[PDB]
RNA sequence: GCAAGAUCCUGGUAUGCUGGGGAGCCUGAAAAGGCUACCUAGCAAGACCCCUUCGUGGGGUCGCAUUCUUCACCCCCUCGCGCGAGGGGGUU
DNA sequence: AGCTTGGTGTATACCAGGATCTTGC
DNA sequence: TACACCAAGCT
């Protein structure tokens, strides 16, 4: 049921939102506007402070579980082992807290006479020690961690504090020996530092290694007088340590062959192939022109690269040694960086690194390994590159060989080349069979040997493959479901067009390096703007801004020639002219004196001036280097040193700095990633063109079709000068993708080179073919925008989580509180009560037939009775038994014999009760515990339909009035929210609006809003889905850094966020024509009942089922 | 040649919280309370698998990602002749 | 009494490396 | 951060 059209999309992809759009095209021009929508995603990230993603955190998470796991496995076999010895562990309980402390210190320095006491001591020593190992580098062998000096660096150093503090001295100076003096001492001493809280110092100010405890558990068995195997026994059992292995399913299989996993550098094949690669990229001349060498000649070069230890062959060695040529200046071809005097020519070539550092280790170990010896020179080359493969990728989860451990372990140790080539161990092997012989190229070997085409390439990725990048999944996400519900409705598009700025490969400290950018952008610049003003400058200007700046910072100072200047007297000079490839930028400038101004003469700078009198070098970099950051300017510390380097490098340049090139249309990955789906995609169903463009370029079109934001959307100035920003509303992106489909590479490129000419500084209009063609033939879309936004089309929406993952209470565990039956109970005493059969008894006893608790906090409903016995199934409770309590009267659950709070909601069941005429509504709001205790976290559940026993904390807090109602049984559940669900209350608006909200709808009329949570059982969190709150922020930051720059709108817009409306639900959910709505992938209402989540209205919704 | 950085991944560490203990200090001194430390067990709820010790408890992995849960249709891939497990899409 | 208003607590730090891709003249 | 909870103000 899909018509063909021809259309184009327009995608514009932002940090926390897409924009997208469907634009059908007759004959080069916008006929109309299919489908416009904004998406707002959260980019994956769950964690907001620290800004790492929901993957982040399910990684750490799982990999704390995993260093528990092990460590409770390696404990208890330290625990056997200290069984067989004899040694009795440390207890758990009735024990003194220093007896540990002590003991490591007694054996340390004493030697225990009485056997059992010694074996009881050693025991808790062994046990203190495998506790409190330390830290070690994981790669390390037990080994590799003896090997390292004893004691370490640190731990010397907290020796020497400690003596410097405390004026004693104990032999030998162990962690336990002072640490269990410290305690017998002082006590309430800090052995390590916390981070957050009063001045006090602890003990230990370095986080102890090891190798420490590794050298006070050997200084213990020495002067104990214990057997070395004993003390290799208890190292090797208290040091336990899983090896860091990269697991499988984690590395790409090779693109040639995908059943056989690549192969790594190390591996002997590709040695040999970069060898033979090599040799053959060098275009012998041979008759005056580029002829490929000889066969002989190939062979020859191609071994003599395969029998070096060492690095011996170099670049330059190869023409005049084996090539067989005699001029060294007959080679071209070369991939290497060029330079004068032979820079490509004295480095060494590449050879067989991995037989050179396997020889080199094995002529330095012939002694330890005979047996690899053998193995490696007296076996043949194809077992030996398996063996070798074997021993480069042995650190991997999921060794053929089957040797004991002395052996090997000399062995296990050497790591061979790292890194991982793109090419399998099957697949390299097969074409070097197939290449050393036919005297062909890599491109016809790989053409030949398996059967591919000359135009055949490695497969791009589907539509439908995660990135593993969160950003760039979310916006593939929503682009893939636009893309395919586009195709399913109106057919291919016929091209594709995509633009995204910055947010790509960028990280929160990169958001942080921005703002602070910005900052000391528009504060360091407010000195010298008041003193113009001060003198009366009516030119703002931004070279007058950055002419000044460096007035301030050099005090108008020419150091080549002296000459103390003013401003009058600046005369800005550039490192490098704009015609020998030069910016208006930051750090080409330098101060001038008239003098030593024109003496560059277009030269390179303080390169001519440098090979004269009056003017020298290497000192005036010696005074940029100690030039230490100033505490109130621009140039903040995180980049200061960043600007004097980049000065520093421009200043001793000899040639020009190549060169005036423009963005080269792709640079992110997620410009790559986004730009091989779509053509995939395309060379699947049949687009076109597939552009992915940079920038800055759809707001040059937007502003020469004559297309503004707050002309079309009707918004106000927020600014006290000029008009309202451009990242005011939300659907500013979907309006920029409609824009974006008209744009072409040629036009594109013409608009991003008219703003980088005028950014450099009026106005200058662009002059081609293409940018006429392009302006005639889109005078139409003003129109289309105005007409569409009119309609109320372009939509602002948000992805539903409904997945019940995450964290399902908060993460810090609390203490019961307690209390005993026959006293005086309140409604907050009988809603704390942990355990739900107790808790639906006591249920019954304030009412037998009540199935919920309707009680107020304050309220007291329960007197003390002398009697009360409650019969239970397994147990009765007196009246003087206690009873388990959570802490505090909210949601809380029972992990691990304590009260964890619940977590944030996950949705909230709508429950409307009541006449037609006006019913009541009351949400049942539930978190990811409440399906967790009522046993919902499992296959083939609802989690918005099944419902919670009266006992879990969602049905605990609930609103009494809904309970009440529920009890009843009049209250039916009509729909869900989650946070993210739209709002659209109509054409009016809201009309129960009072106080700020009024004042924020005086200037800003929504009828859409966002559920942002649920703060209590009364009522719902909601924000405008057109507004954005980020410029929201920056309004706030803007008013409280800078006073009287706002309009009233915009003080108030800036007051009403970020709580927005905090609204009752009574008052939210009783506007008559509210709808709830979800939309599809293109924005557009879902409103048919299919097994996708669809709008509702909470007025008419019909009941479940 | 041209380093990075970002995304994760694997292995660790210290603190902290709860439960059990206490070295010191402070009250009550009739008795059991607090504080600073330190020791010890656990640190998402739990699911599935191996058991024989058929029950009594011990071992192995997974469990906060893929934002329309579950159900339902379609598509791709894998163990696999039907379909168990991974993904993807679903127009108002 | 039933709304609106403001202020606040929340488990936080580290480490050392493995793939993958890009950079850039 | 930012959301659920907990102190209120006050009309």
Same mark, same amino acid.
Request: net charge positive.
């Given at each position: 049921?899909?018509?063909?059209?021809?259309?184009?999309?327009?995608?514009?992809?932002?940090?926390?939102?897409?924009?997208?759009?469907?634009?059908?095209?007759?004959?080069?021009?916008?006929?109309?506007?299919?489908?416009?929508?904004?998406?707002?995603?959260?980019?994956?990230?769950?964690?907001?402070?620290?800004?790492?993603?929901?993957?982040?955190?399910?990684?750490?998470?799982?990999?704390?579980?995993?260093?528990?796991?092990?460590?409770?496995?390696?404990?208890?076999?330290?625990?056997?082992?200290?069984?067989?010895?004899?040694?009795?562990?440390?207890?758990?309980?009735?024990?003194?807290?220093?007896?540990?402390?002590?003991?490591?210190?007694?054996?340390?320095?004493?030697?225990?006479?009485?056997?059992?006491?010694?074996?009881?001591?050693?025991?808790?020593?062994?046990?203190?020690?495998?506790?409190?190992?330390?830290?070690?580098?994981?790669?390390?062998?037990?080994?590799?961690?003896?090997?390292?000096?004893?004691?370490?660096?640190?731990?010397?150093?907290?020796?020497?504090?400690?003596?410097?503090?405390?004026?004693?001295?104990?032999?030998?100076?162990?962690?336990?020996?002072?640490?269990?003096?410290?305690?017998?001492?002082?006590?309430?001493?800090?052995?390590?530092?916390?981070?957050?809280?009063?001045?006090?110092?602890?003990?230990?100010?370095?986080?102890?290694?090891?190798?420490?405890?590794?050298?006070?558990?050997?200084?213990?068995?020495?002067?104990?007088?214990?057997?070395?195997?004993?003390?290799?026994?208890?190292?090797?059992?208290?040091?336990?340590?899983?090896?860091?292995?990269?697991?499988?399913?984690?590395?790409?299989?090779?693109?040639?062959?995908?059943?056989?996993?690549?192969?790594?550098?190390?591996?002997?094949?590709?040695?040999?192939?970069?060898?033979?690669?090599?040799?053959?990229?060098?275009?012998?001349?041979?008759?005056?022109?580029?002829?490929?060498?000889?066969?002989?000649?190939?062979?020859?070069?191609?071994?003599?690269?395969?029998?070096?230890?060492?690095?011996?062959?170099?670049?330059?060695?190869?023409?005049?040694?084996?090539?067989?040529?005699?001029?060294?200046?007959?080679?071209?071809?070369?991939?290497?960086?060029?330079?004068?005097?032979?820079?490509?020519?004295?480095?060494?070539?590449?050879?067989?690194?991995?037989?050179?550092?396997?020889?080199?280790?094995?002529?330095?170990?012939?002694?330890?390994?005979?047996?690899?010896?053998?193995?490696?020179?007296?076996?043949?080359?194809?077992?030996?590159?398996?063996?070798?493969?074997?021993?480069?990728?042995?650190?991997?989860?999921?060794?053929?060989?089957?040797?004991?451990?002395?052996?090997?372990?000399?062995?296990?140790?050497?790591?061979?080349?790292?890194?991982?080539?793109?090419?399998?161990?099957?697949?390299?092997?097969?074409?070097?069979?197939?290449?050393?012989?036919?005297?062909?190229?890599?491109?016809?070997?790989?053409?030949?040997?398996?059967?591919?085409?000359?135009?055949?390439?490695?497969?791009?990725?589907?539509?439908?493959?995660?990135?593993?990048?969160?950003?760039?999944?979310?916006?593939?996400?929503?682009?893939?479901?636009?893309?395919?519900?586009?195709?399913?409705?109106?057919?291919?598009?016929?091209?594709?067009?995509?633009?995204?700025?910055?947010?790509?490969?960028?990280?929160?400290?990169?958001?942080?390096?921005?703002?602070?950018?910005?900052?000391?952008?528009?504060?360091?610049?407010?000195?010298?703007?008041? @003193?113009?003003?001060? &003198?009366?400058? !009516?030119?703002?200007?931004? $070279?007058?801004?950055? #002419?000044? +700046? /460096? %007035?301030?910072?050099?005090?108008?100072?020419?150091?080549?020639?002296?000459?103390?200047?003013?401003?009058?007297?600046?005369?800005?000079?550039?490192?490098?002219?704009?015609?020998?490839?030069?910016?208006?930028?930051?750090?080409?400038?330098?101060?001038?004196?008239?003098?030593?101004?024109?003496?560059?003469?277009?030269?390179?700078?303080?390169?001519?001036?440098?090979?004269?009198?009056?003017?020298?070098?290497?000192?005036?970099?010696?005074?940029?280097?100690?030039?230490?950051?100033?505490?109130?300017?621009?140039?903040?510390?995180?980049?200061?040193?960043?600007?004097?380097?980049?000065?520093?490098?421009?200043?001793?340049?000899?040639?020009?700095?190549? @060169?005036?090139?423009? &963005?080269?249309? !792709?640079?992110?990955?997620? $410009?790559?990633?986004? #730009?091989? +789906? /779509? %053509?995939?995609?395309?060379?699947?169903?049949?687009?076109?063109?597939?552009?992915?463009?940079?920038?800055?370029?759809?707001?040059?079109?937007?502003?020469?079709?004559?297309?503004?934001?707050?002309?079309?959307?009707?918004?106000?100035?927020?600014?006290?000068?000029?008009?309202?920003?451009?990242?005011?509303?939300?659907?500013?992106?979907?309006?920029?993708?409609?824009?974006?489909?008209?744009?072409?590479?040629?036009?594109?490129?013409?608009?991003?080179?008219?703003?980088?000419?005028?950014?450099?500084?009026?106005?200058?209009?662009?002059?081609?073919?293409?940018?006429?063609?392009?302006?005639?033939?889109?005078?139409?879309?003003?129109?289309?925008?105005?007409?569409?936004?009119?309609?109320?089309?372009?939509?602002?929406?948000?992805?539903?989580?409904? #997945?019940?993952?995450?964290?399902?209470?908060?993460?810090?565990?609390?203490?019961?509180?307690?209390?005993?039956?026959?006293?005086?109970?309140?409604?907050?005493?009988?809603?704390?009560?942990?355990?739900?059969?107790?808790?639906?008894?006591?249920?019954?006893?304030?009412?037998?037939?009540?199935?919920?608790?309707?009680?107020?906090?304050?309220?007291?409903?329960?007197?003390?009775?002398?009697?009360?016995?409650?019969?239970?199934?397994?147990?009765?409770?007196?009246?003087?038994?206690?009873?388990?309590?959570?802490?505090?009267?909210?949601?809380?659950?029972?992990?691990?014999?304590?009260?964890?709070?619940?977590?944030?909601?996950?949705?909230?069941?709508?429950?409307?009760?009541?006449?037609?005429?006006?019913?009541?509504?009351?949400?049942?709001?539930?978190?990811?515990?409440?399906?967790?205790?009522?046993?919902?976290?499992?296959?083939?559940?609802?989690?918005?339909?099944?419902?919670?026993?009266?006992?879990?904390?969602?049905?605990?807090?609930?609103?009494?009035?809904?309970?009440?109602?529920?009890?009843?049984?009049?209250?039916?559940?009509?729909?869900?929210?989650?946070?993210?669900?739209?709002?659209?209350?109509?054409?009016?608006?809201?009309?129960?609006?009072?106080?700020?909200?009024?004042?924020?709808?005086?200037?800003?009329?929504?009828?859409?809003?966002?559920?942002?949570?649920?703060?209590?059982?009364?009522?719902?969190?909601?924000?405008?889905?057109?507004?954005?709150?980020?410029?929201?922020?920056?309004?706030?930051?803007?008013?409280?850094?800078?006073?009287?720059?706002?309009?009233?709108?915009?003080?108030?817009?800036?007051?009403?966020?970020?709580?927005?409306?905090?609204?009752?639900?009574?008052?939210?959910?009783?506007?008559?024509?509210?709808?709830?709505?979800?939309?599809?992938?293109?924005?557009?209402?879902?409103?048919?009942?299919?097994?996708?989540?669809?709008?509702?209205?909470?007025?008419?919704?019909?009941?479940?089922?």
């Amino acid at each position: 049921g899909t018509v063909p059209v021809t259309w184009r999309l327009g995608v514009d992809v932002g940090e926390r939102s897409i924009g997208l759009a469907a634009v059908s095209y007759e004959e080069d021009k916008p006929k109309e506007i299919l489908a416009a929508v904004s998406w707002i995603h959260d980019g994956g990230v769950g964690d907001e402070r620290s800004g790492a993603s929901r993957l982040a955190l399910r990684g750490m998470a799982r990999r704390a579980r995993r260093l528990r796991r092990f460590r409770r496995a390696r404990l208890r076999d330290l625990d056997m082992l200290l069984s067989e010895l004899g040694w009795t562990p440390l207890p758990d309980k009735n024990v003194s807290p220093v007896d540990a402390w002590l003991a490591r210190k007694r054996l340390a320095e004493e030697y225990v006479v009485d056997e059992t006491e010694r074996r009881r001591l050693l025991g808790y020593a062994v046990s203190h020690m495998a506790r409190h190992r330390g830290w070690r580098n994981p790669w390390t062998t037990i080994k590799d961690l003896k090997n390292l000096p004893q004691p370490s660096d640190s731990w010397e150093r907290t020796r020497e504090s400690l003596e410097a503090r405390y004026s004693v001295s104990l032999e030998p100076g162990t962690v336990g020996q002072w640490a269990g003096y410290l305690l017998q001492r002082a006590p309430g001493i800090r052995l390590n530092p916390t981070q957050q809280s009063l001045s006090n110092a602890t003990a230990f100010e370095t986080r102890l290694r090891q190798e420490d405890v590794l050298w006070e558990l050997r200084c213990i068995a020495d002067v104990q007088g214990l057997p070395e195997d004993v003390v290799s026994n208890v190292i090797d059992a208290v040091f336990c340590q899983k090896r860091p292995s990269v697991p499988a399913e984690r590395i790409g299989r090779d693109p040639l062959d995908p059943s056989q996993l690549r192969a790594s550098r190390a591996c002997l094949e590709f040695q040999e192939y970069r060898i033979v690669a090599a040799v053959a990229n060098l275009r012998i001349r041979d008759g005056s022109g580029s002829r490929p060498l000889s066969l002989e000649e190939r062979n020859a070069v191609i071994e003599a690269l395969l029998a070096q230890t060492e690095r011996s062959l170099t670049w330059s060695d190869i023409a005049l040694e084996i090539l067989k040529l005699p001029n060294e200046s007959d080679l071209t071809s070369v991939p290497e960086e060029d330079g004068p005097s032979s820079l490509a020519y004295s480095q060494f070539a590449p050879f067989d690194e991995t037989s050179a550092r396997i020889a080199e280790f094995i002529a330095k170990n012939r002694r330890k390994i005979p047996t690899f010896a053998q193995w490696w020179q007296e076996q043949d080359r194809t077992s030996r590159s398996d063996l070798v493969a074997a021993l480069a990728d042995n650190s991997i989860a999921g060794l053929l060989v089957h040797l004991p451990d002395a052996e090997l372990e000399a062995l296990e140790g050497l790591a061979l080349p790292s890194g991982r080539v793109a090419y399998s161990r099957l697949t390299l092997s097969g074409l070097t069979r197939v290449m050393r012989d036919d005297g062909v190229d890599v491109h016809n070997a790989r053409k030949t040997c398996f059967g591919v085409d000359d135009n055949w390439r490695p497969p791009l990725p589907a539509l439908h493959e995660a990135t593993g990048h969160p950003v760039v999944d979310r916006n593939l996400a929503i682009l893939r479901k636009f893309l395919s519900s586009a195709t399913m409705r109106w057919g291919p598009p016929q091209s594709i067009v995509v633009e995204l700025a910055r947010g790509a490969s960028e990280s929160r400290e990169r958001q942080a390096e921005e703002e602070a950018a910005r900052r000391a952008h528009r504060k360091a610049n407010d000195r010298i703007r008041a @003193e113009l003003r001060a &003198s009366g400058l !009516s030119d703002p200007s931004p $070279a007058d801004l950055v #002419r000044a +700046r /460096l %007035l301030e910072l050099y005090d108008c100072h020419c150091m080549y020639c002296g000459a103390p200047i003013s401003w009058e007297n600046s005369e800005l000079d550039h490192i490098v002219p704009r015609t020998d490839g030069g910016s208006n930028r930051h750090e080409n400038l330098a101060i001038t004196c008239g003098a030593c101004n024109k003496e560059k003469g277009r030269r390179p700078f303080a390169s001519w001036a440098e090979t004269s009198n009056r003017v020298q070098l290497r000192d005036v970099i010696d005074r940029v280097q100690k030039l230490k950051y100033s505490g109130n300017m621009y140039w903040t510390r995180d980049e200061f040193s960043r600007y004097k380097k980049s000065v520093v490098a421009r200043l001793k340049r000899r040639t020009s700095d190549p @060169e005036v090139i423009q &963005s080269i249309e !792709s640079t992110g990955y997620a $410009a790559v990633a986004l #730009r091989d +789906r /779509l %053509l995939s995609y395309g060379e699947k169903n049949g687009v076109a063109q597939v552009a992915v463009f940079r920038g800055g370029v759809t707001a040059e079109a937007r502003r020469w079709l004559d297309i503004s934001i707050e002309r079309l959307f009707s918004r106000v100035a927020i600014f006290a000068q000029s008009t309202s920003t451009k990242r005011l509303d939300r659907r500013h992106h979907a309006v920029d993708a409609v824009v974006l489909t008209t744009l072409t590479p040629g036009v594109a490129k013409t608009l991003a080179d008219a703003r980088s000419r005028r950014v450099s500084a009026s106005t200058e209009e662009p002059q081609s073919p293409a940018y006429r063609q392009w302006k005639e033939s889109c005078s139409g879309l003003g129109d289309l925008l105005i007409s569409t936004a009119a309609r109320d089309s372009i939509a602002v929406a948000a992805p539903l989580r409904l #997945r019940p993952t995450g964290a399902l209470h908060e993460e810090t565990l609390r203490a019961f509180s307690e209390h005993t039956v026959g006293a005086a109970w309140k409604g907050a005493e009988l809603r704390r009560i942990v355990e739900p059969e107790v808790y639906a008894a006591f249920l019954a006893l304030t009412d037998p037939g009540g199935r919920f608790l309707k009680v107020s906090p304050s309220e007291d409903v329960l007197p003390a009775d002398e009697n009360r016995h409650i019969v239970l199934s397994d147990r009765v409770l007196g009246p003087r038994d206690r009873v388990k309590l959570f802490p505090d009267d909210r949601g809380s659950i029972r992990v691990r014999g304590g009260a964890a709070y619940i977590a944030s909601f996950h949705h909230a069941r709508v429950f409307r009760w009541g006449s037609s005429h006006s019913p009541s509504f009351a949400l049942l709001r539930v978190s990811l515990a409440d399906l967790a205790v009522a046993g919902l976290l499992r296959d083939g559940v609802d989690v918005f339909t099944a419902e919670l026993p009266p006992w879990t904390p969602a049905w605990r807090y609930a609103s009494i009035a809904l309970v009440k109602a529920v009890e009843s049984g009049d209250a039916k559940q009509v729909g869900w929210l989650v946070p993210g669900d739209e709002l659209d209350f109509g054409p009016e608006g809201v009309t129960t609006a009072a106080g700020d909200l009024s004042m924020f709808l005086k200037y800003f009329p929504e009828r859409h809003w966002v559920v942002t949570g649920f703060e209590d059982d009364k009522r719902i969190n909601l924000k405008p889905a057109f507004l954005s709150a980020e410029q929201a922020e920056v309004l706030r930051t803007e008013r409280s850094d800078r006073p009287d720059t706002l309009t009233e709108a915009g003080e108030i817009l800036a007051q009403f966020f970020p709580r927005c409306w905090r609204a009752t639900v009574a008052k939210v959910l009783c506007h008559p024509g509210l709808t709830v709505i979800r939309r599809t992938a293109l924005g557009q209402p879902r409103w048919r009942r299919g097994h996708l989540p669809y709008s509702w209205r909470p007025w008419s919704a019909d009941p479940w089922s």
